[PDB]
A paper describes a structure:
The flavivirus MTase is believed to catalyze both the N7 and 2′-O methylation steps, and may also act as a guanylyltransferase (GTase) to form the G5′-ppp-5′A linkage, thereby playing key roles in the capping process.
The unit cell contains three NS5 hexamers (trimer of dimers) in the H3 space group, and the asymmetric unit comprises a NS5 dimer with the two molecules arranged in a pseudo two-fold symmetry. Unlike previously reported RdRP structures, the RdRP region of NS5 is intact, with motifs F and G completely resolved. Mediated by the linker, the MTase domain is attached to the backside of the RdRP through key hydrophobic interactions (details below), shielding the top-right rim of NTP entry channel. Of the key findings in the full-length JEV NS5 structure, are the intra-molecular interactions between MTase and RdRP, with a total of 1480 Å2 buried in the interface. This involves residues Pro113, Leu115, and Trp121 from the MTase, and Phe467 (ring) Phe351 (index/βNLS core helix), and Pro585 (middle) from the RdRP fingers domain arranged in an alternating fashion.
Residue numbers in the entry: 5 to 270, 274 to 895
Write the structure that this text describes.
């Protein structure tokens, strides 16, 4: 009770609730929050309304010189993001990163479109007390949880000051740090030591309410700490006991405006000029060059107004949910959501993942890739001969529902792909562009880039933004397919031809292939994921892929050359973006590197390059090359590379399983784990691991991740063994619980549930919970109804369950009949003779067996089934529950 603050606190703690809320707002300045709250209600994130009162507080501080935010701003305990968004409106600020705890009983970051929103990056679920410090130019911290006990607040405050000191030690000359309880002795001492070392002073905002004693240690203040605090205490004490409460003085809230901001700094225009010109002309009406466009590594050409496209909804699948009551309690399943594919949705991912420049590899690294890719092209073409693909081939393999991909009104004459390929007028458009290509010109081959609708873990209690996919229109895709599609159609990256690849194989083959690799002598199995593979394909990588041309001649070569040079290298792309005031715009941008996700040969070229990368890593691992060769390759090891490849290559690729950017490799020893110098120089940086930390390997091949699964060997009842795919049961159920959009009627969602159920039966029958849930779903869905919808995006999903045939029959087809690693072709006649994984593995991968929630669920499954049957209604049903032992 010694300090005046302690007297204030004690008097505060003794107030009645009614008086507390009068005193709280007495004589303070308060921003009118009315309009902001209506904005929050009406989902208006483009009107300039700040997410909290925190924007006004920071505004007051900069308008008074107390802090002048600049450069890279770090914001500790950002909450909704109030400070972060205000900083981003400021000219001198170029980057904002917020961190915050989030979760139950804490504020999550809110996603806004305030001016400069593209400079901001908020992160939730972070405990900053144990987050390693990072360099920054401006540092913010608004952490400090109140308490009726000054002693508690004192210790909390100290913990923050102690924490911020680690961050101040790394440069920030600008700062603004909350000091929750400034009047307590140990805090006073800490402030004095900190002020000496880093400067600044303690300030009390007139925007703060009288119910706290918070002060801000800001870099552009100064003064005696003690004096400052006592002056605050006195004001506070003075405002107690009034005869008449006069209330606060009202101010207007800050208006943060809207729209993206330009990034600083940021030219083979010949080969793209026609395309741009044709677009500028077709959309001249509102065409313009936005000075505030957010592109940093893409070159920008212009923008025009368009109607926004995409969705931000996730809806629940009612039938799956009814059959999965125990998972209602699993956060991992219920916080999953469809990704946001609105333009704001994809753009907020675009600025992090796609607008990056992967550096070109250094000269020595190039020379080694050169020899490797020479070797690899030679090896792939040892037996196979390139060829044109035909119109008829295209028409037969085009999905009747492939994207049209119109980029010009002229390309938008058909309502489905099937109609286009059936219309002579389409092929006339193709021919016309074809003849242009033969003359080394390209007029209309242009990508649309948009958000991919995906089922993913949530973010800030809501949906994640979307991954960008891009592809050219049906006509351009035909031309690609004609020139380069032989790679696909004649299976140039099949295992038989590539050694390392796995083209064509369903998931059901993948485990067996991993096992075969395990049988070779060598070290641990590795499986490093490259972060954002397509965005890391360099000019060098493209130049090496371009060596297909040397396998081609005449007309065939010329067509292929146009695809490769005019279409894969000189890419022109159309992407939507949020403009100001709720309107959206189509940007036309370009760049020479990176790989477009929806090129006809993306998988092939990815597989090809990934094999070459692994070959290079193995050479560094086996000693042929090292860091001393990155800047220049000596003639002698340049030759060793050649001979290494020549003598070893064919064996070495058999130690790989390469599916696009997905890789598994069993090197000779474990020097591989530190063979990272070339890997990093080639820009193929590893995902989720410090740049130079060695790679983790596995001893058990059954724990190796490949194409989103790992694989388990299980011995069946009749003594035969199978290798099956296995993965987190939480997400499997999480995804089945999500419907692809709004407005889906009972029958359609029932048919999607039925596809998820049947995919489970065919691939994850060995997971106890799923087999029960699958039979339960199929028992609640009318037998006649036909499975519809996507259950996977993986190229290795072959969809055998998308059928009305009995699932046991198809089980035998893929697991016995067509399974080349199963000698004994003895058919399985009943489900009970189909194995499970060990309960140890089942539980490790999310199973709920042995739990009482599950028990209740299992025992009462029929009630669940009947609930769904009622909703669907009188129809023809069948009970499959009896195919499980416990229901006989
Ligand atoms: N240890 C911790 N690590 C990260 N965040 C924390 C934390 N302790 C508290 N927080 C969070 O930090 C936030 C401070 S309130 C932030 C207000 C913000 N300046 C604005 O204007 O919007 C709270 O939401 C709180 O949940
Ligand atoms: Zn073209
Ligand atoms: Zn598993």
């Amino acid at each position: 009770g010694r300090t005046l603050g302690e007297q204030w606190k004690e008097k505060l703690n003794a107030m009645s609730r009614e008086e507390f809320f009068k005193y709280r707002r007495e004589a303070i300045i308060e921003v009118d929050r009315t309009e902001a709250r209506r904005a929050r209600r009406e989902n208006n994130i483009v009107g300039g309304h700040p997410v909290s009162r925190g924007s006004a507080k920071l505004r007051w501080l900069v308008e008074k010189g107390f802090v002048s935010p600049i450069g890279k701003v770090i914001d500790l305990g950002c909450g909704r993001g109030g400070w972060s968004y205000y900083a981003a409106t400021l000219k001198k600020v170029q980057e904002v990163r917020g961190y915050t705890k989030g979760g139950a009983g804490h504020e999550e970051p809110m996603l806004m479109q305030s001016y400069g929103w593209n400079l901001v990056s908020l992160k939730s679920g972070v405990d900053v007390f144990y987050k390693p410090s990072e360099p920054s130019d401006t540092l913010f911290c608004d952490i400090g949880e109140s308490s009726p006990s000054p002693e508690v607040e004192e210790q909390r405050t100290l913990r923050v000051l102690e924490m911020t000191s680690d961050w101040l030690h790394r440069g920030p000359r600008e700062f603004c740090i909350k000091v929750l309880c400034p009047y307590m002795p140990k805090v006073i001492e800490k402030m004095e030591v900190l002020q000496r070392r880093f400067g600044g002073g303690l300030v009390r905002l007139p925007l703060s309410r009288n119910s706290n004693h918070e002060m801000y240690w800001v870099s552009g203040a100064a003064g005696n700490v003690v004096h400052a605090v006592n002056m605050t205490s006195q004001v506070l004490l003075g405002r107690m006991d009034r005869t008449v409460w006069r209330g606060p003085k009202y101010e207007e809230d800050v208006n943060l405006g809207s729209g993206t901001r330009a990034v600083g700094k940021g030219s083979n225009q010949e080969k793209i000029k026609k395309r741009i010109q044709k677009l500028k002309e077709e959309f001249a009406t509102t065409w313009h060059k936005d000075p505030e466009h957010p592109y940093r590594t893409w070159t920008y050409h212009g923008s025009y107004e368009v109607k926004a496209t995409g969705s931000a909804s996730s809806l629940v699948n009612g039938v799956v949910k009814l059959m999965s009551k125990p998972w209602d309690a699993i956060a991992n399943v219920t916080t999953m959501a469809m990704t946001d594919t609105t333009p704001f949705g994809q753009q907020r991912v675009f600025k992090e993942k796609v607008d990056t420049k992967a550096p070109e590899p250094p000269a020595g690294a190039k020379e080694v890739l050169n020899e490797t890719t020479n070797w690899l092209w030679a090896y792939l073409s040892r037996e196979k001969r390139p060829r044109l693909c035909t119109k008829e081939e295209f028409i037969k393999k085009v999905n009747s529902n492939a994207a049209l991909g119109a980029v010009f009104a002229e390309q938008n004459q058909w309502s489905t792909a099937r109609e286009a390929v059936d219309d002579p007028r389409f092929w006339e458009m193709v021919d016309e562009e074809r003849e242009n290509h033969l003359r080394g010109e390209c007029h209309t081959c242009i990508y649309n880039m948009m958000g991919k609708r995906e089922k993913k873990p949530g973010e800030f209690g809501k949906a994640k933004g979307s991954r960008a996919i891009w592809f050219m229109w049906l006509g351009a895709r035909y031309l690609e397919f004609e020139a380069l599609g032989f790679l696909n159609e004649d299976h140039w990256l099949s295992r038989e031809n590539s050694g390392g690849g796995v083209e064509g194989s369903g998931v059901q083959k993948l485990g067996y292939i991993l096992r075969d690799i395990a049988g070779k002598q060598g070290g641990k199995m590795y499986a490093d994921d490259t972060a954002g593979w397509d965005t890391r394909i360099t000019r060098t990588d493209l130049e090496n892929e371009a060596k297909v041309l040397e396998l081609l001649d005449g007309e065939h070569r010329m067509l292929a050359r146009a695809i490769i040079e005019l279409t894969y290298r000189h890419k022109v792309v159309k992407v939507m973006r949020p403009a100001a005031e709720g309107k959206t715009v189509m940007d036309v941008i370009s760049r020479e590197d990176q790989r477009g996700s929806g090129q006809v040969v993306t998988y092939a070229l990815n597989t090809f390059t990934n094999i070459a990368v692994q070959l290079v890593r193995l050479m560094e691992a086996e000693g042929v090359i090292g860091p001393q060769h990155l800047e220049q390759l000596p003639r002698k090891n340049k030759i060793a590379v050649r001979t290494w490849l020549f003598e070893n290559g064919e064996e070495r690729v058999t130690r790989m399983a390469i599916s696009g950017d997905d890789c598994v490799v069993k090197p000779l020893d474990d020097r591989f784990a530190t063979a990272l110098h070339f890997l990093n120089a080639m820009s193929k940086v590893r995902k989720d691991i410090q740049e130079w930390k060695p790679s983790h390997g596995w001893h058990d091949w059954q724990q190796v991740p490949f194409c989103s699964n790992h694989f388990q060997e299980i011995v069946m009842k009749d003594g035969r063994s199978i290798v099956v795919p296995c993965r987190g049961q939480d997400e499997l159920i999480g995804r089945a619980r999500i419907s692809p959009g709004a407005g889906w009627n009972v029958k359609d969602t029932a048919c999607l549930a039925k596809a998820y159920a049947q995919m489970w039966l065919l691939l994850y029958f060995h997971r106890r919970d799923l087999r029960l849930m699958a039979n339960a779903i199929c028992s609640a869905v009318p037998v006649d109804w036909v499975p519809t919808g996507r259950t996977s995006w993986s190229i290795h999903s072959k969809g055998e369950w998308m059928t009305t045939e009995d699932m046991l029959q198809v089980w035998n087809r893929v697991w016995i009949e067509e399974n080349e690693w199963m000698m004994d072709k003895t058919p399985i006649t009943s489900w009970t003779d189909v194995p499970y994984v060990g309960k140890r593995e089942d539980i490790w991968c999310g199973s709920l067996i042995g739990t009482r929630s599950r028990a209740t669920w299992a025992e009462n499954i029929y009630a669940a089934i009947n609930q769904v049957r009622a909703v669907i209604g009188k129809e023809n049903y069948v009970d499959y529950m009896t195919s499980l032992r416990r229901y006989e």
